[PDB]
From TrEMBL, chain A:
It comes from Bos taurus (Bovine). It comes from the Eukaryota. The BBSome complex is thought to function as a coat complex required for sorting of specific membrane proteins to the primary cilia. The BBSome complex is required for ciliogenesis but is dispensable for centriolar satellite function. This ciliogenic function is mediated in part by the Rab8 GDP/GTP exchange factor, which localizes to the basal body and contacts the BBSome. Rab8(GTP) enters the primary cilium and promotes extension of the ciliary membrane. It holds the Pfam family BBL5. This is Bardet-Biedl syndrome 5 protein homolog.
Automatic annotation (TrEMBL), chain B:
Residues 1-336 form the PTHB1 N-terminal domain. It comes from the Eukaryota. This is Bardet-Biedl syndrome 9. Residues 344-368 form a coiled coil. Signal peptide: none annotated.
From TrEMBL, chain C:
The gene is TTC8. GO terms for biological process: axon guidance; camera-type eye photoreceptor cell differentiation; establishment of anatomical structure orientation; establishment of epithelial cell apical/basal polarity; establishment of planar polarity; fat cell differentiation; inner ear receptor cell stereocilium organization; multi-ciliated epithelial cell differentiation. CDD domains: TTC8_N (cd21341). It comes from Bos taurus. One of its GO terms (molecular function) is RNA polymerase II-specific DNA-binding transcription factor binding. TPR repeats lie at residues 322-355, 393-426. The keyword Amino-acid biosynthesis does not apply. The lineage of its organism: Eukaryota, Metazoa, Chordata, Craniata, Vertebrata. This is Tetratricopeptide repeat domain 8.
TrEMBL record, chain E:
One of its GO terms (biological process) is gene expression. One of its GO terms (cellular component) is BBSome. The chain holds residues 7 to 58 of 69 of the full protein. It comes from the Eukaryota. The lineage of its organism: Eukaryota, Metazoa, Chordata, Craniata, Vertebrata. This is BBSome interacting protein 1. It comes from Bos taurus (Bovine).
Length: 300, 368, 475, 82, 52
């Protein structure tokens, strides 16, 4: 469903670069040349709400899309002294489904390098806010007896005595309904709580309050049971209404081809062999490559 | 990939929280008995988190409890008077708390809950700084706790209550404390560059068993004892790296050219030697055979309190925890990768726009 | 959480700003608290700390106006005071360029104060030569006789005075009172007094304390300190014996082997410095010094592929410089790996935090270009090297060679004159000027230039034939 | 003679060149094109700012600084080259 | 299936002519850690002086 902040795509279409409903553009910069691919071609860089995009600005087909849940390090490099003005450069390190890429972005015209700052800022806002768009078990949600609300979140329905049909004897627990996510704590050792976001929900039906996950948190079917079913169907219908009105415009809580092969961070390596034990060092070491030895790789 | 710390289950651990040494512990606090360890991390922001990682995923975090006062030096040892089952110790600045992580199961991967029970607590008069734990004297099946203080005093609890407490003679800034069992001695590094060992029964009677004037003050001291042949005591200063004998003199020393932050002499290989791994402030791990570098790796973050443990059927996984909040299990990268330009065919050199710009610039040149 | 605890934990994690700040608070709150006092002292003195071992500027006075070597004209091979200049670039009459600039490099010495002044400021040291090598606590207010009684305070206070304030006299006063308080039984105070002496100028009075500290307890620190002292008295063969003694104590120390190799390279017998750098490698294998040195030597003795391996090693260990990437470019091009050649020069030009580094990268790009042909690209690269560093003599020489290739003789003559004026120790501008002069005539200028060439590279061949022809024309 | 020796690195590098010569040729030509582009760019920028101490209209100037202390002697060596 | 034939004889110099020599490619020496720290501490003072 949502891939803009979860993958890293190359030669993306002119439509997938367009702002998703919940997405929103923040800052832009022209003439940002792309490097780590020596095409020597200019472009335009965009720091959106969920991902960073770069399109060639002359052949807008060739482009890059990097999600914020797939970046590890972002480094700004101020160099290239007096000969001209102090120009910056952006080094982004990315790891998607166990494959490490690195992209470099060179600001050609030294007259507008401010972009490289705001990105950093929003990236923090992307990581400090994951309870908005991700699924978590047993977190630190509950205060003394109440829920700790996110910034853009207020409770809708406050129901006591809502069971959980995934355990045996620690069930009876409160059920908080909010505009961003729905949570249930256990009211007895209140660290068995589940916080499901509307973004991860696929369909709320009955078989009993069955909630299915959207192929990202796996097929996690959650079952709850309440007092006589009047309030039950009431809660189900209001939950479906809130789900649809959210999916209309997502929130995301962010406050404020061979293309891949030319962007590997390792260098001609998209792999990680099976980590096996090492009797030489005593550490878990990556498997050695068909004849190589540790004391032969170490020396020069 | 060569000389990088390839990634295993990794995570970020809060909202601009802050950790230190002693935070990262790695043992069987669940008392399963299978060998697979479990990560435990407690910041002095308040949250105590326990994980059972599997090779990001939601069900990895066992629990994320929050205590009011900050947390210093979570430990895992037999801190209960009755049984021989591992219990988790949490040292707040003016508080001691032994817990018990009991995990009950449901009929689904995420129907299993985890309860921490306050086995007992201890009000701390002085302000605690750090602590050590061990079988003081020659006792077995018990793990007494010797906590330090920010003002020098060290107070010893015999696993149940306030056994005693003695002031360290002549210390201002409290350094790293450890306990050697092959000599039954509390070993510390005073502010005046003296690595000092005190016999336990000597302190219990209140003095110095021995001293050694190393060139600096130490960040950590780790007495390791999985070798019963020749005992040794490791002392990592802020400029050097000593391995001392049991009488008190340097067995050997390394003059590091970087700034260490953490070290851990883990399981050894050869006869008599001890493999060790140290973490720069330059984001690297170094793996010495007591003086001699055997391997080196580029870490992502500045390692604080590294550990090595068997996590989910993979022995010797290195678990690092930064002080900002990162955490990462990792395995060494041993894949020499060809240095060669990527044979990319899709990405071509756009000759049209480039030739336009080159014609413009060459026109300027040949015109002037 | 608590002030003192959080500040001390900031100190353990090497923050060094947060600790001083919480202590400044904690000191404003209480005028009587020495823990936070010495903690702020530690933080302040460690924000600026740099170990005294590898700080050997020696200035310009201690190069001429200070005589300490016993022997005035000792045997060639026992005093500090390979590839020929036709392959390896040079810095002085001899002394080929080295890898791994360290701030203790002297790389030759001037003869007179005038020569040392009228040369580039950074031609005998890694940094431009000098003439000689509110506030937290005011040094004139505290009675060092009372802080000396408390060693826990005295040690951090001395480190503060010595490494932060650089007050060697008050530091020595404190260290003397402290040593007399310890009845001369702690090697640390002896080493510190020896350092105070060594940077006051008194070498023998420092060697005494370093020897007396070695007698107390062998440490790598005191061994390196005595090595510095002995090198200052121009005694290499004493320093080597002391280093081998230290290695007898510490069987595989890397700093001792590296000091032995540094001494062997200062004496310029590379056939042993490579052996000792190889021992360092067998111990460390990430040592930047040994790797860089063996890599340079492998590149210049027409083995650029082994040098490319040795530099790809430093690339593998997270080193990210302008020097490293330009080196990788030179190696890749000369080892015939044309795919990773120019991208390394691009990363170099990106990483260059200067105007001389950019000029050197453009110079090397011009070398790549002239190896490719297309002399116009090399022309532009040499002119850009000149634009970025006006006092770049190699760019002048190469641009004059390309000019005379085109035909413009007067341009080449002027550029070679500029090159030979900037760097007299080089031999190529003199030889080329003499050659072009002799080609057109002017045998006086040809002689005055070929003789300076022979003065620069005295074992040349074409210079000898030129001088023979000239002296034959004079009769 | 002093004819040099070649190790395993050389034969592995020549094998890579013999098996992947086309990609090396193409990428080196692309890099050379980009290098000509950037060198022409910097040459034009220098001509604009007139920052070349060597630039019909023949001249050559370079400035030498001498002396420590608060007072430095700055001598411009200028030369007509025609 | 015909392979282009290459001459088996190269070009051989028959006289040594004095040609102007070029300077030689210059491997930029690396730095130590103390030197980098000293330069950065020297420039940080300049930066604070300019930033007051």
């Amino acid at each position: 469903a949502l891939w803009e902040d979860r993958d890293v795509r190359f030669d993306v279409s002119s439509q997938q670069m367009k702002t998703r409903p919940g997405e929103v553009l923040i800052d832009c910069l022209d003439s940002v040349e792309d490097t780590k691919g020596n095409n020597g071609d200019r472009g335009r860089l965009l720091v959106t709400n969920l991902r960073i995009v770069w399109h060639s600005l002359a052949l807008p087909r060739v482009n890059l899309s990097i999600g914020y849940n797939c970046i590890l390090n972002i480094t700004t490099r101020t160099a290239n002294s007096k000969l001209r003005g102090q120009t910056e450069a952006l080094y982004v390190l990315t790891k998607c489904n166990s494959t490490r890429f690195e992209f470099i972005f060179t600001n050609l015209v030294p007259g507008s390098p401010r972009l490289y700052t705001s990105l950093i800022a929003v990236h923090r806002a992307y990581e400090t806010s994951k309870m908005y768009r991700d699924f978590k078990l047993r977190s630190a949600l509950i205060q003394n007896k109440q829920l700790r609300l996110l910034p853009q979140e207020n409770v809708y329905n406050k129901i006591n005595g809502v069971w959980n049909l995934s355990s045996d004897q620690g069930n009876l627990g409160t059920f908080f309904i909010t505009n961003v996510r729905i949570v249930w704590h256990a009211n007895m050792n209140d660290s068995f709580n589940v916080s499901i976001p509307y973004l991860q929900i696929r369909s709320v039906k009955i078989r009993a309050l069955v909630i299915e996950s959207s192929q990202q948190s796996g097929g996690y079917v959650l079952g709850f049971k309440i007092d006589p079913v009047e309030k039950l169907q009431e809660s189900v219908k209001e939950i479906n209404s809130l789900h649809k009105v959210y999916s209309a415009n997502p929130i995301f809580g962010v406050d404020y081809t061979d293309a891949f092969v030319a962007y590997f961070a390792d260098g001609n390596k998209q792999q990680d062999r099976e980590p096996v034990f090492s009797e030489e060092l005593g550490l878990a070491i990556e498997k050695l490559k068909d004849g190589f030895t540790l004391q032969g790789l170490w020396e020069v | 990939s060569l000389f990088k710390a390839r990634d295993w289950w990794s995570t970020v651990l809060g909202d601009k929280e802050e950790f230190d040494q002693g935070c990262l512990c790695l043992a069987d606090v669940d008392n399963t008995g299978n060998g697979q360890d479990k990560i435990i991390v407690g910041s002095f922001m308040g949250y105590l988190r326990i994980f059972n990682p599997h090779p990001a995923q939601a069900e990895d975090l066992l629990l994320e409890v929050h205590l009011r006062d900050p947390i210093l030096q979570v430990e895992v040892g037999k801190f209960v008077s009755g049984t021989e089952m591992l219990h988790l110790a949490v040292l707040h600045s003016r508080k001691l708390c032994v817990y018990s992580v009991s995990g009950t199961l449901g009929n689904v991967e995420h129907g299993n809950q985890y309860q921490i029970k306050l086995m007992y607590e201890h009000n701390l008069q002085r302000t605690a700084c750090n602590m050590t734990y061990g079988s003081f004297g020659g006792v077995k099946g018990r793990d007494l706790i010797c906590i330090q203080s920010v003002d020098g005093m060290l107070m010893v609890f015999e696993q149940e209550s306030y056994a005693f407490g003695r002031f360290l003679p002549g210390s201002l800034l409290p350094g790293p404390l450890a306990y050697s069992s092959r000599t039954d001695s509390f070993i510390t590094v005073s502010s005046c560059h003296q690595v000092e060992s005190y016999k336990y029964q000597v302190l219990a009677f209140a003095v110095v068993d021995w001293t050694l004037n190393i060139g600096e003050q130490a960040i950590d001291i780790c007495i390791v004892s999985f070798i019963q042949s020749a005992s040794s005591v490791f002392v990592l200063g802020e400029r050097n790296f000593f391995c001392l004998k049991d009488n008190g003199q340097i067995q050997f020393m390394k003059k590091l050219d970087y700034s260490p932050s953490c070290f851990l002499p883990y399981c050894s290989v050869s006869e008599g030697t001890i493999n060790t791994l140290i973490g720069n402030h330059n984001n690297m791990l170094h793996i010495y055979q007591d003086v001699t570098l055997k391997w080196a790796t580029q870490l992502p973050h500045v390692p604080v309190a590294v550990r090595v443990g068997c996590l989910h059927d993979l022995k010797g996984v290195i678990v690092t925890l930064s002080d900002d909040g990162h955490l990462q299990c990792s395995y060494l990268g041993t894949d020499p990768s060809l240095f060669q330009a990527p044979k990319v065919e899709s990405r071509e050199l756009n000759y049209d726009e480039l030739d336009m710009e080159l014609k413009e610039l060459q026109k300027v040149i040949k015109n002037v | 959480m608590e002030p003192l605890l959080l500040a001390w934990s900031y100190f353990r994690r090497r923050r060094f700003q947060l600790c001083a700040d919480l202590c400044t608070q904690m000191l404003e709150k209480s005028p009587c608290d020495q823990a936070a006092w010495i903690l702020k002292a530690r933080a302040l003195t460690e924000m600026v700390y740099v170990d005294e071992i590898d700080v050997d500027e020696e200035g310009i006075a201690e190069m001429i106006l200070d005589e300490n070597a016993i022997a005035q004209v000792p045997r060639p091979g026992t005093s500090l005071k390979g590839p020929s200049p036709a392959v390896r670039p040079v810095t002085q009459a001899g002394r080929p360029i080295t890898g791994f600039l360290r701030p203790s490099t002297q790389s030759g010495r001037p003869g007179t104060i005038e020569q040392a002044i009228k040369t580039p400021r950074t031609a005998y040291t890694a940094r431009p030569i000098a003439s000689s090598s509110g506030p937290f606590i005011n040094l004139s207010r505290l009675n060092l006789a009372k802080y000396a009684q408390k060693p826990k305070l005295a040690k951090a206070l001395f480190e503060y005075i010595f490494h932060h304030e650089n007050d060697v006299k008050t530091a020595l006063d404190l260290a003397a009172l402290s040593t007399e308080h310890s009845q001369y039984k702690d090697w640390w105070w002896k080493v510190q007094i020896g350092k105070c002496y060594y940077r006051l100028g008194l070498y023998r009075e420092a060697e005494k304390q370093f020897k007396s500290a070695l007698k107390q307890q062998e440490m790598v620190d005191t061994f390196l300190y005595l090595a510095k002292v002995y090198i200052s008295l121009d005694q290499p063969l004493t320093a080597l014996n002391l280093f081998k003694q230290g290695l007898d104590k510490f069987p595989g120390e890397v700093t001792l082997l590296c000091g032995i190799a540094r001494i062997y390279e200062e004496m310029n017998n590379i056939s042993s410095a490579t052996e000792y750098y190889k021992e360092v490698l067998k111990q460390d294998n990430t040592h930047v010094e040994a790797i860089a040195c063996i890599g340079s030597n492998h590149f210049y003795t027409d083995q650029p592929e082994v040098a490319l391996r040795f530099y790809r090693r430093l690339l593998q260990m997270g080193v990210y410089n302008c020097q490293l990437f330009n080196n990788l470019g030179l190696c890749c091009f000369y080892a015939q790996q044309y795919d990773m050649t120019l991208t390394s020069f691009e990363r170099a030009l990106s990483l260059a935090e200067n105007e001389e580094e950019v000029a050197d990268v453009w110079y090397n790009l011009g070398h790549v270009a002239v190896g490719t042909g297309d002399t116009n690209l090399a022309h532009q690269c040499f002119r850009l090297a000149l634009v970025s560093n006006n006092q770049h003599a190699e760019a002048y020489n190469n641009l004059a060679v390309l000019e005379m290739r085109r035909g413009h003789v007067e341009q080449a003559k002027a550029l070679l004159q500029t090159a030979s004026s900037l760097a007299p120790h080089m031999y190529e501008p003199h030889f080329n000027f003499a050659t072009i002069s002799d080609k057109i005539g002017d045998l006086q200028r040809s002689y005055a230039a070929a003789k300076k060439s022979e003065a620069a590279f005295p074992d040349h061949v074409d210079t000898q034939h030129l001088i023979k022809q000239l002296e034959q024309h004079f009769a | 003679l002093n004819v040099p020796r070649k190790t395993r690195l050389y034969v592995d590098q020549t094998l890579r060149e013999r098996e992947a010569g086309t990609a090396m040729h193409r990428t080196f030509q692309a890099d050379l094109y980009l290098l000509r582009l950037r060198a022409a760019r910097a040459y034009v920028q220098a001509l604009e700012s007139s920052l070349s101490p060597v630039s019909r209209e023949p001249l050559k100037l370079h400035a030498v600084v001498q002396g420590l202390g608060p007072t430095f002697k700055l001598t411009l060596h200028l030369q007509n080259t025609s | 299936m015909f392979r282009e034939v290459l001459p088996k004889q190269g070009q051989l110099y028959v006289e040594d002519i004095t040609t102007m020599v070029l300077c030689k490619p210059k491997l930029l020496p690396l730095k130590s850690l103390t030197l980098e720290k000293l330069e950065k501490m020297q420039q940080a003072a300049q930066d604070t002086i300019h930033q007051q």
